[PDB]
């Protein structure tokens, strides 16, 4: 309750949250992935996204669960920057565009939404959005 830490870590979303409207683990198909940006080429998309979750006080037993986003970070940025791409952990995906690199990308960033609108989600056609998952 005193000096609270609003940033757990580098919590900067160059994107959109995408919200889990169902009981998916959210996941994408080879090929596709990590939203495009044209001010990238295809070699820098590789990402991972990562769960939120956050609990609040609203049932009279237990403290009632918010809904929950996920926010996708480029492999070398976020707050799981020292995390392998290839690292098993629970409550992370991976992603990556055919062509990616396993470089991390300092060049691109970890630009926080604070400065500057964050890129609207975008994907390419061929893309399978996950039930409970859309893309927007």
């Known amino acids: 309750s005193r000096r609270p830490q609003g940033l757990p870590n580098n919590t900067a979303s160059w994107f959109t949250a995408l919200t889990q409207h169902g009981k998916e683990d959210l996941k994408f198909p080879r090929g596709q992935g990590v939203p495009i ?3 990238s080429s295809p070699d820098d998309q590789i990402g991972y996204y990562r769960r939120a979750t956050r609990r609040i006080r609203g049932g009279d037993g237990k403290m009632k669960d918010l809904s929950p986003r996920w926010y996708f970070y480029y492999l070398g940025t976020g707050p ?3 995390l392998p791409y290839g ?3 629970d409550g992370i995906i ?4 055919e062509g990616a690199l396993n470089t991390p990308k300092d060049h691109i960033g970890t ?3 604070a400065n500057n609108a964050a ?5 390419p056609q061929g893309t399978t959005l996950p039930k409970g998952f859309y893309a927007e």
Request: positive net charge; charged residues 15%; aromatic residues 4%.
């Open 37 to 39: 940006n044209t001010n």
């Open 80 to 82: 799981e920057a020292g």
């Open 87 to 89: 690292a098993n952990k």
């Open 94 to 97: 991976w992603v990556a565009t």
């Open 111 to 113: 630009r926080n939404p």
């Open 119 to 123: 890129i609207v989600l975008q994907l």
